[PDB]
C-alpha cells in the first residue's frame, strides 16, 4: 500500500511531461474521462511548468511530484463526484482560464501560484456531503469550525500537506512571500463555499454592470479572485453535452447518497435535488440551478475577459439541453 504509493513516485518523477498542446489542457472543452491517473498528474506538472511557477519558485521536480501525488491520495475514491478528478478538472479549467482566457497577464506570480494550489486542493477529504448536512447532523467538524465548515477543513488539509516533509513545494519562497501566498490560498478555498459566492456576487455583478469594475483596485481584485474560484469549481456545467451529461450523473448519485442518509440517520426529508426518488425532476432542477447560479456568473467573467466566453457559450448550451429534457 505504502509500496504502490512509493513506486508511483519513482515512475512519475522520471517520465517525460508532454507539451500542453499534446495534452489539450489549453482547451475549455477538455475531458479527463480517457486519461489514466498517471496522466492527470503529468498534466498538473505541465500546468505548474507552463505557468512559470516551477522556475520562478525554485521547485524541485522530486518535491512537486511527491506533493501532487499526496493531494491525489487525499481525495476519497469512494466519493462519487468530489474525488480527485474534480480537483483536477477544476485546476485545468483554472489553467485554461489563465492561458487561453488570457488572465495571466492580469495578475502576479504570487497570485497565479496560489490559485493553482488552491484549485487543486479546494475539496480535500470531501466526504461526499454538503455543509448543510454536516451542520444539521452535528458532525464534530461543525463543532470545530464556525462558517464554511467543509471549506475550512479542505484548507486545514492543504496546509497539512504543504508542511509535510518532501512536499514543501513552497520551500523556495521568502518568508514574506510564503506568508501572503498562504493568505490568498485560504481566501481562495473558502471562496468555493457557495454561500459566500451568493453573499458576495451581488457586489461584483454591479461593478461589472456599471462598467466600473477594475482589477487595479486591490479589493476589487481579491473579490474577483473569489469569483474566479467559483467559476472553475463548477466549470463542469460548461462542458460539451456528452460530458456534462455524464458528470451530472455523478453529482446525481452523490446527492442521492446523501439523501439516503438524511432519511436513514437524520429521519428528515431530503430536498428533491438529493431525493433519489425524484430522479425525473433532475433536468428542471439543473435548469433552475444554472439560471440561479451559473449563467449570471460566466456572463460577468466574459465582460472581464472576452476570451473566456467559451465558458458562457458551453453553459447556456447545456442549459438549452436540460430545458428540452425537462419537457421530456
Amino acid at each position, epitope marked *: 500500500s505504502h509500496m504502490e504509493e512509493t513506486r508511483e513516485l519513482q515512475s512519475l518523477a522520471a517520465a517525460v511531461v508532454p507539451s500542453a498542446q499534446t495534452l489539450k489542457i489549453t482547451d475549455f472543452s477538455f475531458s479527463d474521462f480517457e486519461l489514466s491517473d498517471l496522466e492527470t498528474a503529468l498534466c498538473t506538472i505541465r500546468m505548474f511548468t507552463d505557468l512559470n511557477l516551477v522556475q520562478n519558485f525554485q521547485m524541485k521536480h522530486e518535491v512537486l511530484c511527491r506533493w501532487i501525488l499526496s493531494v491525489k491520495k487525499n481525495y476519497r475514491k469512494n466519493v462519487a463526484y468530489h474525488n480527485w478528478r474534480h480537483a483536477f478538472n477544476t485546476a485545468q479549467c483554472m489553467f485554461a482560464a489563465l492561458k487561453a482566457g488570457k488572465i495571466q497577464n492580469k495578475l502576479t506570480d504570487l497570485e497565479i501560484l496560489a490559485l493553482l494550489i488552491a484549485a487543486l486542493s479546494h475539496d480535500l477529504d470531501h466526504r461526499g456531503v454538503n455543509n448543510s448536512y454536516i451542520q444539521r447532523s452535528e458532525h464534530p467538524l461543525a463543532q470545530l469550525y464556525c462558517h464554511s465548515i467543509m471549506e475550512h477543513h479542505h484548507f486545514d488539509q492543504c496546509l497539512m500537506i504543504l508542511n509535510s516533509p518532501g512536499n514543501q513545494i513552497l520551500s523556495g519562497l521568502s518568508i514574506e512571500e510564503y506568508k501572503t501566498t498562504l493568505k490568498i490560498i485560504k481566501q481562495a478555498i473558502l471562496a468555493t463555499d457557495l454561500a459566500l459566492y451568493i453573499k458576495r456576487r451581488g457586489e461584483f455583478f454591479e461593478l461589472i454592470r456599471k462598467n466600473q469594475f477594475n482589477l487595479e483596485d486591490p479589493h476589487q481584485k481579491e473579490l474577483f479572485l473569489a469569483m474566479l474560484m467559483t467559476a472553475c469549481d463548477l466549470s463542469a456545467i460548461t462542458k460539451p453535452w456528452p460530458i456534462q451529461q455524464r458528470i451530472a450523473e455523478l453529482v446525481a*448519485t452523490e446527492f442521492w447518497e446523501q439523501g*439516503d442518509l438524511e*432519511r*436513514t440517520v437524520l429521519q428528515q426529508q431530503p430536498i428533491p435535488m438529493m431525493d*433519489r*426518488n425524484k430522479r425525473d425532476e433532475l433536468p428542471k432542477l439543473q435548469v433552475g440551478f444554472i439560471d440561479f447560479v451559473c449563467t449570471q456568473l460566466y456572463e460577468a467573467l466574459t465582460h472581464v475577459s472576452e476570451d473566456c466566453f467559451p465558458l458562457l457559450d458551453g453553459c447556456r448550451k447545456n442549459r438549452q439541453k436540460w430545458q428540452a429534457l425537462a419537457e421530456q
Partner: antibody
Framework: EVQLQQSGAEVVRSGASVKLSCTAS????????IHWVKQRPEKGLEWIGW????????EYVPKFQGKATMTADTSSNTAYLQLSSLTSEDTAVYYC?????????????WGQGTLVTVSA | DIVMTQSQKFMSTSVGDRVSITCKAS??????VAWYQQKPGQSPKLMIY???NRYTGVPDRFTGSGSGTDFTLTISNMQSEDLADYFC?????????FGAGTKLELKR
C-alpha cells in the same frame, strides 16, 4: 444464508382483505428495494411494484392502485403486502423479492411465495 | 410494457444434454436481462444477469448470451437438479417484466 421467508397460504372471502408478510434473515432490507410480483395459475409473473424500506417510498403499477398497499419495517426486517376488496382474479401466488436500491432490477433474493385463494 | 416471450412452455431433456432456452424482448433491452430458476413451492433464484454473467455461486454449467431482443440461457451437461422452471426478466426500464417460464422435464 440470505433468505426471504413469506407467510403461509390464505383462503379468503371475496370483498375482504388480507395482509402478507415477507421476513428477511441473514441480511438487512434497508439498502434494498423490496418488490412484489404476482403469478396467476397458468400465467406469467406480473410485477406489482416496490417499496424503499428506508424511507417508506412506494411505487405501484396502475393495475394495482388501491388494490395493493406495501409497507416495511427495517428493525424487524419485514415487508408487508395488503390486498383489499379481493376478487376471484386476485387468486395467485405472491412473491416478495429484493434487490440493491442502486441496482436497475436484478432479483437475487426471492421469498418462496404465498398462495392466496379468493372465493365467495 | 415490454413483453418478454418464452415460446417453449416445456422441453424434454436428459442428464448430460446441452439445453438452450430462448427469450425474446419486444423492444431493445440491451443486455439488461436476468434469468431465474424456480422449483415447486420454492423461491426463484438468480442465475444469470446482464444477459451473460453468472451470479455468485451458480455452477459453471449455466451460461447466457444475447442482446437487443434475442436472449438464450444455456445449460451444458444438464444435471438432475437442473430440472425446474426458468424465466427471463428485463430490467431495461419500468415496469420490469418477466417471461412466462419454460419447464425442463425428464425424457423416458
Amino acid at each position: 444464508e440470505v433468505q426471504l421467508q413469506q407467510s403461509g397460504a390464505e383462503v379468503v372471502r371475496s370483498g375482504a382483505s388480507v395482509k402478507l408478510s415477507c421476513t428477511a434473515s441473514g441480511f438487512n432490507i434497508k439498502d434494498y428495494y423490496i418488490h412484489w410480483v404476482k403469478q396467476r395459475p397458468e400465467k406469467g409473473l406480473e410485477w406489482i411494484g416496490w417499496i424503499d424500506p428506508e424511507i417508506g417510498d412506494t411505487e405501484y403499477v396502475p393495475k394495482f392502485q388501491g388494490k395493493a398497499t406495501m409497507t416495511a419495517d427495517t428493525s424487524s426486517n419485514t415487508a408487508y403486502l395488503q390486498l383489499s376488496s379481493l376478487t376471484s382474479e386476485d387468486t395467485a401466488v405472491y412473491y416478495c423479492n429484493a434487490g440493491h436500491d442502486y441496482d436497475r432490477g436484478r432479483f437475487p433474493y426471492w421469498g418462496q411465495g404465498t398462495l392466496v385463494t379468493v372465493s365467495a | 410494457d415490454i413483453v418478454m416471450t418464452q415460446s417453449q412452455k416445456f422441453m424434454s431433456t436428459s442428464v448430460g444434454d446441452r439445453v438452450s432456452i430462448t427469450c425474446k424482448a419486444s423492444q431493445n433491452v440491451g443486455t439488461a436481462v436476468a434469468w431465474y430458476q424456480q422449483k415447486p413451492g420454492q423461491s426463484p433464484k438468480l442465475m444469470i444477469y446482464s444477459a451473460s454473467n453468472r451470479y455468485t455461486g451458480v455452477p459453471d454449467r449455466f451460461t447466457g448470451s444475447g442482446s437487443g431482443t434475442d436472449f438464450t440461457l444455456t445449460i451444458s451437461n444438464m444435471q438432475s437438479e437442473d430440472l425446474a422452471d426458468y424465466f427471463c426478466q428485463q430490467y431495461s426500464s419500468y415496469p420490469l417484466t418477466f417471461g412466462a417460464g419454460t419447464k425442463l422435464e425428464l425424457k423416458r
